[PDB]
DNA sequence: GGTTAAAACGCGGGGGACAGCGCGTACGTGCGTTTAAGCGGTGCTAGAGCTGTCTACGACCAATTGAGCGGCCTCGGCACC
DNA sequence: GTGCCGAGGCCGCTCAATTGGTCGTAGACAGCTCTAGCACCGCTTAAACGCACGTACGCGCTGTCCCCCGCGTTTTAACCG
């Protein structure tokens, strides 16, 4: 291509953007200019951002859903902060992920230790009552 | 229909009310661009019927901000020791394998090397 | 007297289950998956009759592995054999 | 009116009950009359609820057949022809009820 | 034209390259074994029959002569269990969306 | 600019309809198997893309599964042993294959607590039960 | 009496032993242990040399190297705060 | 000459007959609930027109994958200390 | 003398390697449906109108496994077709 000629009609997409292109749905343009904007490296790849947007899409997807199951056993159809907490203590490999993670407006585990319960029919040792 | 320019248009709200009909527009706000749009759009394909309040979307969008800054941040650092001065997938999909647990990990690596494949395939 | 009133059911064909309660039953059941559900008198009397046969093929085959362990009762191990074998739960 | 899942008139014109645990509809004589069909002379105290919680596991697959079946046609009743449908993809097929 | 040999050009209702492709990408360094094939060929079939099957009732029973995704939706959960389908939809639903804003 | 109702740049198979929307499973002979197949008198054009897609998807899985039993089992290659293998320890997988034998297979190494010696115990250690 | 002559392939994971374990438990100012803390060592070792590894292998694979460097060590250590100078 | 089954009859349990106790039933009544009707009101499902982008049809050629081959690493097995 | 530790070794697992015709993706110009607008009654909706069936309390008989307890079953052995 050369002379700064018309090139014609645009074979190469102009509606689709690039996530389009690869069927996902994150702004992969986006991820490109963050990473040029928190100065990661001096260059950044082609498919530096296609891939980040995938890993972030498939990390919304199975968080949401998993936050949706919750949400089903709760009786809400709105997810709230609480369901996500029970999510990311129920999964081992997102508990491992967001350890230290603390979820803003709720979000706790029902979990009691088996002390908490003497469950000896009150029957002190010996003798029934104390 | 009109022909704008480039010199007088940078931040071109209301400083002074002449306006006619409808008020002139606020100061711009700081755009605090958020995965929220796209977020929901992912919400609908898993479950369709089920909502999302605002608390856990910014949650989400806390969380993605974050997330981010530790594979880009550890795949930063990863040039750095293999003295590269570009940064591409393969590099993230190390980094994935570090920060991520295992299973979690090749779910994001194989799902990400079909999503790049269908963008360097296709035109 | 257990015995004798297995003439009586299997001469003379009738329902075996209370209409209604079946009916609430499939109900509360529905609702959970959508609520509001409508349903037709003749539908529901239709599953009745189903489910009840589908129990009687189950209590048929329990009887038959009662015999097996030189037993007569039929116990919730008999129920777990016949469901396994045939399928339906495992 | 209008009418959207139902229950449009409201005020004192209608009227619903909490249904939680109508399992128990099926009681002894019921579930005996069902095992003297199939012909067993006694039957435990304990297979009383396995009984019901085998006819919910058998009613719950069938239920989600003819729901979706009638959800297709976005029909707000369950006609019997629905029902005799789903009845045909699990095998525990019943002549009548429509043809 | 036909005088060479050509009689040998047939048949191929086979999914064989398609999952060998799904497995690379699956995969990316695996082998398969043309005895496998075999086993994943057979098994699609059944499975595009299966749903078929089912979609060519739910046509008659409602009157419609044309076939859609709603109705493979329907067939789609009425074969599949509840976490098989869940991942399903979400899958065929993104084709269509793609499909539709692509030209 | 003027190109009639549409231009000449191309016309013969500029981009398939498979791969159209990022699909790699065949949609034409999906749509011909569905019309030369007496389905239906007529089909729609969405029936094909979201069918294929969900072949695609059962295809993938089964074969993730296999691929990892069969790094269990030390070997690169997929065998009939890891398909079985994958269909059988899933329950979901169980009910739809269940009444299906496949070719070179196996069975899961399943025995009761009174096949193995005490009368019937069934501690045993890690790696079992 | 009691002796064994197999080098290989049947103590690598034991090659700790009763003594060492006591040795380390003397730098840790422990004056007495339980004999069950022999197995859990090599387990709760093994868990330490696993993770570290599994990063360390990775910047050694990602790098194009058949050789991990003992820089190579220093980055599997820094993630999980393990730091070594 | 060794392996399983098969005769003899171990052997301490599991079941029916020996017995209570506690329910769940399912007939008379009145009041609205839900399923069917009675007839529209725009919205969708199937009728063709025009000339084009795509699948089915059809061609050869060098390369491309899966059979098999030969050394090796792994396994069950008998015999001394 | 026993059980499990091993060593040598036997065919296939995974890599390559040169030749015939199988399959897939690019290219034209002929009919047909894809998908897009419009019709009028038919299938499903809400709100009344009636009609026996269904819930709550009655008198009755029905059953399960507790204890003590036989003799026919199918394993445990060391020796033949």
Redesign the interface.
């Known amino acids: 291509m050369s002379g700064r000629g018309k090139q014609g009609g645009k074979?190469?997409?102009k509606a689709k953007t690039?996530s389009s292109?690869?069927?996902?749905?994150?702004?992969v343009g986006?991820?490109h200019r963050?990473?040029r904007k928190?100065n990661?490296?001096?260059?950044?790849?082609?498919?530096?951002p296609?891939?980040?947007?995938?890993?972030?899409?498939?990390?919304?997807?199975e968080?949401?859903?998993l936050?949706?199951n919750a949400?089903?056993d709760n009786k809400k159809?709105?997810?709230?902060?609480r369901?996500?907490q029970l999510a990311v203590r129920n999964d081992e490999?997102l508990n491992?992920?967001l350890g230290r993670?603390t979820?803003?407006?709720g979000g706790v585990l029902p979990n009691i230790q088996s002390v908490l319960l003497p469950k000896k029919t009150e029957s002190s040792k010996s003798a029934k009552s104390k | 229909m009109a022909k704008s320019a480039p010199a007088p248009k940078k931040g071109s709200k209301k400083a002074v009310t002449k306006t006619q009909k409808k008020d002139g527009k606020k100061r711009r706000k700081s755009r605090k661009?958020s995965?929220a749009i796209?977020?929901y759009?992912?919400?609908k394909?898993?479950?369709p019927?089920?909502?999302?309040?605002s608390?856990?979307m910014?949650?989400?969008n806390s969380?993605?901000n974050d997330?981010?800054?530790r594979?880009?941040?550890?795949?930063?650092?990863?040039?750095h020791?293999?003295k590269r001065?570009?940064?591409?997938?393969?590099?993230?999909?190390?980094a994935?394998?570090?920060?991520?647990?295992?299973?979690?990990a090749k779910?994001?690596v194989?799902?990400?090397?079909?999503?790049?494949?269908?963008?360097?395939?296709?035109? | 007297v257990a015995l004798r009133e297995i003439r009586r059911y299997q001469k003379s064909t009738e329902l075996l289950i209370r209409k209604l309660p079946f009916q609430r039953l499939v109900r509360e059941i529905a609702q959970d998956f959508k609520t509001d559900l409508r349903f037709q008198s003749s539908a529901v009397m239709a599953l009745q009759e189903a489910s009840e046969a589908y129990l009687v093929a189950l209590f048929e085959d329990t009887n038959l592995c009662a015999i097996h362990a030189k037993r007569v009762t039929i116990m919730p191990k008999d129920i777990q054999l016949a469901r396994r074998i045939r399928g339906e739960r495992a | 009116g209008k009418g959207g899942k139902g229950l449009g008139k409201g005020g004192a014109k209608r009227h619903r009950k909490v249904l939680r645990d109508n399992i128990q509809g099926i009681t002894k004589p019921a579930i005996r009359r069902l095992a003297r069909r199939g012909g067993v002379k006694r039957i435990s105290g304990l297979i009383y609820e396995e009984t019901r919680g085998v006819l919910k596991v058998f009613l719950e697959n069938v239920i989600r057949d003819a729901v979706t079946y009638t959800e297709h046609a976005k029909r707000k009743t369950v006609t019997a022809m629905d029902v005799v449908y789903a009845l045909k993809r699990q095998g525990r097929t019943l002549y009548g009820f429509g043809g």
């Open positions: 074979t190469r997409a690039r292109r690869a069927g996902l749905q994150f702004p986006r991820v963050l990473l928190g990661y490296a001096e260059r950044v790849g082609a498919g530096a296609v891939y980040l947007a995938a890993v972030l899409e498939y990390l919304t997807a968080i949401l859903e936050a949706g949400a089903r159809t709105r997810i709230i902060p369901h996500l490999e491992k992920l993670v979820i803003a407006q | 661009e995965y796209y977020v759009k992912v919400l394909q898993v479950h019927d089920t909502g999302i309040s608390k856990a910014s949650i989400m969380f993605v997330v981010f800054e594979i880009a941040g550890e795949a930063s650092r990863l040039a020791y293999n001065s570009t940064i591409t997938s393969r590099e993230i999909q190390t994935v394998r570090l920060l991520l647990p295992g299973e979690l779910h994001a194989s799902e990400g090397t079909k999503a790049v494949t269908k963008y360097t395939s296709a035109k």
